[PDB]
Design a protein around this nucleic acid. Structure first.
Lengths: 488, 199, 182, 169, 267
RNA sequence: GAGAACAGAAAUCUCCAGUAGAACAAAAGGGUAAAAGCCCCCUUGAUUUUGAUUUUCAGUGUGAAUACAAACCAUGAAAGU
RNA sequence: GGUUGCGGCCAUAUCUACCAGAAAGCACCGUUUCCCGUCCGAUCAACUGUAGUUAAGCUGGUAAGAGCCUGACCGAGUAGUGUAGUGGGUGACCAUACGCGAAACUCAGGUGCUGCAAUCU
């Protein structure tokens, strides 16, 4: 075991003396401080004393008339959120917090037996963290009782690998995609298959996307969008289980499809092209984006989190009526969408060309900004729950953070020793769990841009990781065939 | 077989010496109040607290051989002997040993105003935590007798030495204060021993 | 509410033992056993000293690891521990230094000659004419093979070999005793 | 008033000590197994007396314990072989009792000359409800003298059933 | 004999009664302790007839101090009326105590030096035997699921086979949800009815069935997760009344004057 | 000490005593207790690599032993050892 | 005040012989499908609280029971020991102080308290 060099005798002598008392008697600011909304609003050059964080929060609350805490950041150089009073017009930039705190995850629970093959995918239920479903190489899929950490309501009927598994935003239906050219819908509370398996695809399903609740008709059930390696996408109606519209604009395998909050569908394909499709216009393409040199992998949107957990929140409270659920989903979508002062959603496209592009498909067809610097292909990209930051995973063992507002690079989360497959954002946006080909999982804290804790214990490569809506539990799955649950 | 070899190695001297063990010897004249005081004081010395089985007729200033023999047999570098007499009531003699040879001895007598744990406020305490020390009075750093007292108490109550400490372990502080400054020709002021729970 | 402490003489701290020394003057009358308020003054002084000591301790740097439980010896990432410096007060040792020295009459010759210390590879040694290693010593040693073998061509020679082993062991013990005599 | 101090059988112990640890020992163990239906256990030897030729750790004896109604099923047959007539002796101070017999073939099991003739030492221990305290790992405790089994109590209990006798003291 | 008694040294009172083992207790009370100085609370779980006792206990010179406590007799508050000392009841009690202490400590719903320092506790079972599948390990599993991170291997949970070093999660779930009790009830449903009328009599009185037992256990777990408030009894006939009742039948020691008077007439 | 066919003064079993005139590596303070004793399950280690003494003949920014320290290892549910 | 759990002091807590215990809880007890281990479901593991018993455990009361413990000018500031001086004694020793400083014995008293959580007419 190689050890850090020990301190010298001079270091010991220096440390033996007292110093660094935090009396801070007066610390009267030399320059006035003003509050400005981070988004667009400037709100007033005050000259207060050594006011604490609570005092600043109270001042902002009484300015807003709520005396809703906001996180105070200095001028973005310093870029440091009395915290900033040590460095000395000064402007303090604040953003809504959406008060919540996900307890850091540092311990596992147990190693659970199950599928006799590597785990492939997982997804926590949008409404409760007590139930979760994992897809694995074994043809069967199993739902796990996250409380007791035991299998429950095993899904059977498939005859090939369960490539992808997704949970409906309403939490009433589970959609599972397998290497076989079929998709099956299952009741989470019984495991029964909802009618005959969806069929019509010529090749295995690559990804699944559920229609957002706020766009669905009041009282009706959401549709299910699916993508296949053949390059075609079908919009399946969960009621009739029949694909109303088939789209095959992509000339190669479709990497994934994302259902935007505006009703448009954005998908990446192996043809090095990104296409925007509108469900309203009888499922017809509207625009084509051509900037990636290599194929596009894992297209993502800023609103993905809200759409996934539409009508729900970290508290897990369920809606009473369909109208209330739709209203809550619309409010949740607007909260992130209207952060710019106008209804807009950002889209980030990743590709194996060592570059990622930021797009506003509705506003303009040109890329807003180009994110570059990775040494290898970017496997995974995950927008923050509020769109504040963009994080991407690459095979070069490095994870990079980019500003979600303009795509500017922020920092690189170093520490991984193997290719990073996928990452999942925390509900409060404070933490970020990540998995890599190496033997251990890792979680990063965006606030300090530093590693939070290493989570070893997996016996082989880990391909799947997800964070619960409430943030209480984190699941994972890998080549070891053992499903692991992690929580504070 | 070689089971006792590990014990001998533990008893054997090392570059970094183990935590000093405290042996409390109940004297022949030891009284019930003195025994209770000794038990209460040793409660803070756990897990390094050891109590002898039977009363011992010990005269440290007349013959130091019994103390050396007890230290050698028990491998206890720190020893406290209870003693009570008409002239010296509640005499608690502290003894240090260097290689089982008596290092220094100092007689301490507890005044009748002592208060036991039961009589104090009904608050709890954590066993095994390193106590904090606060020495009051310049005589501690200048007077040879008070310097020896300070050194003995530090070696006795400091516990195991560590370069890394937890904040949660700073539950209580042991305070020693001199009863006012003094000059030559005056009796040595009594040393006040107090333990305070931290909030 | 106040936490700052001011004294005529700065407090001398010993962070390696969590100890603080106060040389400030003390009033004999106030601390006299006959005073009813005796306890209050001592409590206030101890509170001030403990506040100063706690401030100094919290001013120290603290470790912050990113590992997990794993080996129970290491601290969890959630925990952070103050890095106490080495003790400043000198305390007597309980035993003398064990730095006893003796060449055993072997080190002297090994220094006089060019005999380098043996590499000390291991117990395992290849036992020819067999498909097993059977280490030199430690378990089922090859040295015991002569006793278990069937023909000892050229009084039982096995007893002679055992006597030779006993003689060698006794010679080693006698050499150890001779070296201890020094 | 004796609500919960009725004398009852604790366990039946069958032992067969033999002068050697070979064919006879194995055959006696087989006899015990086929009688009680349970595998017996072999008792070691503490010292080499050398008077009878026994050596240390020779595994000289075998015994097996029987409990419940199965124990009574064998005790009644053994007493029938003994004609339900014990002596004032054969009872322990603490209320235990036992006897012995020869030609075990008389009590049921056929001769089977391949197995041979054997006897069996019949020993019985008596207790009362609450004896679990004496053997329970947690909070082990003694038993009051008013509850301890005694020779007279064991004899009285024996008289109550089997129409046995207390033949001359 | 007098000499035997004089030389005889009585063991510790807490050890004379077969309740505490000082050999094992020493390791928990005084750990290695040369490592980082941190408090180490002990989760004491004890099983008695008709009841289960679980307590989080610290260490102090004056004696152990309990921070939180739970008992199986509070389970009926959550709807569990039978098998208070069974495996499922032990799991429920462990989960209840863990969640209760977590809520009381502020982890859900000198705090300097973030983070929150989750509450780690070491299980103590006293003289209870270490056997795989014991309901004590069930209480351990319940506490672990409740948020108390007791370091423990799965070598003793029910369903742990020795042929293969793998825990059977289905058997563990069945034991947690009272699957064994339901299986026994189903077996008795076609066996002798006298035992079925004596055993599970409370179940028949409450109209319990195989699946209803699991449903009741799940509802009790949900209620435990919902209401750990720990509301005690109203305590009718308050402490002074109980003291008077006890003193009514209590036998007082005879004074030395009474002894002398009795002896004067005896002689 | 009370009882058991051979079986007695010594064979093995059941019960009540045993401060320990158990075997404890130790003499020995007189110590060792739901053990440092007895019965049973798993287990290699002369593992490497950093630092201060020793040696030399491509003085080997390492080739080795010694001491310390850190990883690793055995066990248990665990504290811990 | 009784009681269960965890403990501190570790015989005023122990040992022998006698007697009671309203309610609750310990305790015995009832069962071997499951987890579990034994020659034996005796021990232990699990189920049952249902068919009972306060017989036993445990708590409490008694013996001028055995031991044990405490305060003490009772021994006692005594014995013992130590250091000093032409004080007497040729010296050794005798008388004094001058500092430590006992114990048997004896007088009188006693035969469990107490820390935290929970429960009971």
């Amino acid at each position: 075991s190689t050890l850090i060099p020990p301190p010298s005798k001079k270091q010991k002598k220096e440390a033996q003396l007292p110093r660094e008392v935090a009396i801070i008697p007066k610390d009267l600011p030399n320059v006035s401080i003003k509050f400005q909304a981070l988004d667009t609003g400037d709100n007033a050059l005050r000259v207060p004393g050594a006011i604490s964080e609570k005092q600043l929060e109270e001042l902002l609350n009484q300015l807003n008339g709520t005396s809703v805490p906001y996180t105070f950041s200095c001028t973005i150089k310093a870029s440091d959120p009395y915290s900033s009073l040590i460095k000395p017009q000064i402007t303090l930039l604040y953003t809504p917090r959406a008060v919540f705190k996900v307890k850091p995850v540092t311990r596992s629970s147990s190693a659970i037996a199950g599928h006799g093959s590597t785990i492939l995918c997982s997804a926590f239920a949008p409404h409760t963290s007590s139930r979760m479903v994992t897809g694995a190489g074994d043809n069967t899929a199993r739902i796990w009782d996250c409380d007791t950490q035991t299998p429950m309501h095993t899904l059977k009927g498939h005859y090939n690998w369960v490539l992808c598994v997704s949970w409906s935003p309403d939490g009433e239906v589970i959609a599972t995609g397998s290497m076989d050219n079929t998709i099956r819908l299952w009741d989470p509370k019984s495991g029964q298959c909802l009618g005959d398996a969806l069929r019509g695809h010529s090749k295995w399903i690559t990804s699944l996307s559920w229609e957002p609740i706020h766009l669905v008709k009041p009282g009706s059930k959401p549709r299910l969008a699916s993508s296949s390696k053949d390059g075609t996408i079908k919009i399946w109606d969960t009621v009739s289980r029949v694909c109303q519209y088939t789209m095959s604009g992509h000339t190669n395998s479709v990497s994934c499809v994302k259902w935007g909050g505006q009703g448009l569908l954005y998908s990446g394909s192996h043809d090095r092209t990104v296409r925007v499709w509108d469900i309203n216009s009888q499922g017809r393409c509207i625009n084509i984006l051509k900037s990636h040199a290599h194929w596009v992998n894992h297209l993502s949107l800023s609103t993905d989190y809200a759409l996934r957990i539409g009508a729900f929140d970290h508290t897990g409270k369920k809606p009473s009526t369909p109208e209330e659920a739709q209203k809550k989903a619309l409010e949740n979508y607007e909260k992130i969408c209207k952060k710019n002062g106008n209804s807009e959603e950002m889209m980030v496209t990743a590709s194996d060309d060592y570059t990622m592009f930021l797009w506003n498909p509705l506003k303009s067809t040109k890329p807003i900004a180009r994110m570059t610097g990775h040494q290898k292909l970017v496997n995974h990209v995950a927008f923050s729950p509020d769109g504040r930051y963009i994080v991407s995973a690459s095979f070069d063992n490095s994870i990079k953070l980019w500003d979600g507002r303009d795509g500017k690079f922020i920092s690189t989360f170093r520490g991984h020793v193997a290719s990073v497959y996928q990452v999942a954002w925390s509900s409060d946006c404070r933490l970020l769990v990540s998995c890599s080909k190496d033997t251990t999982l890792k979680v990063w804290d965006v606030r300090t841009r530093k590693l939070s804790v290493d989570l070893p214990g997996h016996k082989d490569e880990v391909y799947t990781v997800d964070w619960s809506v409430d943030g209480k539990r984190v699941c994972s799955g890998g080549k070891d065939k053992m499903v692991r649950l992690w929580t504070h | 077989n070689a089971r006792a070899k590990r014990a001998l190695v533990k008893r054997e001297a090392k570059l970094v010496e183990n935590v000093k063990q405290a042996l409390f010897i109940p004297g022949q004249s030891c009284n019930k109040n003195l025994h209770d005081i000794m038990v209460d004081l040793s409660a803070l010395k756990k897990p390094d607290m050891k109590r002898f089985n039977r009363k011992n007729d010990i005269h440290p200033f007349e013959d130091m051989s019994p103390l050396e023999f007890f230290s050698e047999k028990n491998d206890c570098s720190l020893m406290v002997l209870m003693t009570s007499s008409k002239k010296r009531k509640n005499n608690m003699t502290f003894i240090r040993t260097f290689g089982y040879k008596i290092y220094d001895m100092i007689e301490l007598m507890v005044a009748d105003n002592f208060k036991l744990l039961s009589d104090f406020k009904k608050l709890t305490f954590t066993v095994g935590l390193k106590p904090m020390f606060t020495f009051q009075g310049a005589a501690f750093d200048t007077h040879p007798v008070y310097k020896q007292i300070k050194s003995l108490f530090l070696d006795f109550f400091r516990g195991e030495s560590t370069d890394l400490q937890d904040v949660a372990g700073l539950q209580h502080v042991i305070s020693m204060t001199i009863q006012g400054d003094f000059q030559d020709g005056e009796p040595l002021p009594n040393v006040l021993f107090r333990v305070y729970k931290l909030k | 509410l106040p936490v700052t402490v001011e004294k005529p003489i700065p407090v001398v701290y010993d962070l390696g033992n969590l100890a603080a020394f106060d040389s400030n003057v003390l009033d004999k009358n106030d601390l006299d056993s006959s005073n009813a308020r005796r306890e209050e003054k001592i409590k206030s002084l101890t509170r001030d000293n403990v506040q100063l000591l706690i401030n100094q301790l919290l001013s120290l740097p603290m470790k912050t690891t990113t590992e997990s439980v794993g080996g129970t010896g290491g601290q969890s990432s959630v925990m952070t521990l103050l890095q106490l410096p080495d003790p400043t007060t000198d305390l007597p040792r309980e035993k003398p230094l064990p730095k006893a020295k003796a060449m055993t009459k072997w080190e002297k010759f090994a220094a006089k000659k060019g005999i380098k210390p043996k590499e000390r590879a291991g117990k395992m040694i290849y036992d020819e004419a067999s498909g097993e290693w059977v280490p030199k010593w430690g378990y089922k040693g090859a040295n015991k093979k002569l006793d278990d073998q069937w023909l000892v061509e050229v009084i039982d020679p096995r007893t002679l070999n055992r006597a030779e082993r006993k003689r060698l062991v006794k010679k080693n013990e006698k050499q150890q005793r001779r070296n201890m005599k020094n | 008033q004796n609500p919960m101090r009725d004398l009852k059988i604790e366990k039946l112990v069958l032992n067969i000590s033999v002068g050697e640890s070979g064919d006879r020992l194995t055959r006696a163990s087989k006899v015990l197994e086929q009688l009680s239906g349970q595998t017996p256990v072999q008792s070691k030897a503490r010292y080499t007396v050398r008077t009878f030729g026994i050596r240390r750790n020779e595994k000289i004896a075998v015994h097996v314990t029987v409990r419940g109604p199965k124990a009574e099923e064998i005790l009644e047959r053994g007493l029938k072989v003994k004609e339900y007539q014990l002596r004032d002796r054969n009872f322990s101070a603490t209320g235990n009792f036992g006897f012995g017999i020869d030609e075990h073939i008389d009590l049921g099991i056929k001769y089977d000359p391949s197995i041979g003739i054997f006897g069996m030492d019949f020993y019985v221990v008596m207790n009362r409800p609450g004896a679990r305290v004496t053997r329970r790992k947690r909070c082990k405790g003694t038993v009051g003298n008013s509850h301890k089994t005694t020779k007279e109590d064991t004899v009285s209990w024996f008289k109550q059933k089997y129409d046995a006798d207390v033949l001359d003291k | 004999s007098s000499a035997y008694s004089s030389r005889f040294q009585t063991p510790f009172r807490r050890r004379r009664e077969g309740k505490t083992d000082y050999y094992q207790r020493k390791r928990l009370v005084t750990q290695h302790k040369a490592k980082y100085n941190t408090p180490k609370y002990r989760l004491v779980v004890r099983f008695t007839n008709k009841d289960i006792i679980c307590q989080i206990i610290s260490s102090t010179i004056t004696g152990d101090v309990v921070l939180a406590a739970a008992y199986s007799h509070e389970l009926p508050r959550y709807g569990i009326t039978h098998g208070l000392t069974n495996w499922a009841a032990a799991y429920a009690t462990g989960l209840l105590i863990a969640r209760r202490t977590l809520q009381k400590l502020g982890l859900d719903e000198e705090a300097v030096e973030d983070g929150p320092r989750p509450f780690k506790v070491f299980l103590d079972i006293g003289l209870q035997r270490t056997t795989t599948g014991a309901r004590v390990f069930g209480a351990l599993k319940g506490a672990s699921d409740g948020g108390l991170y007791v370091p423990h291997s799965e070598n003793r949970f029910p369903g742990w086979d020795f042929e293969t070093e793998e825990i059977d999660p289905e058997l563990l779930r069945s034991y947690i949800f009272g699957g064994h009790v339901s299986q026994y009830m189903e077996e008795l449903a076609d066996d002798d009815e006298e035992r079925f009328s004596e055993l599970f009599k409370g179940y028949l009185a409450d109209d319990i069935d195989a699946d209803s037992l699991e449903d009741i256990y799940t509802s009790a777990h949900e209620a435990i997760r919902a209401d750990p408030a720990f509301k005690p009894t109203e305590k009718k006939f308050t402490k002074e009344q109980y003291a008077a009742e006890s003193k009514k039948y209590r036998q007082t020691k005879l004074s030395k004057e009474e002894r002398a008077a009795r002896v004067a007439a005896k002689i």
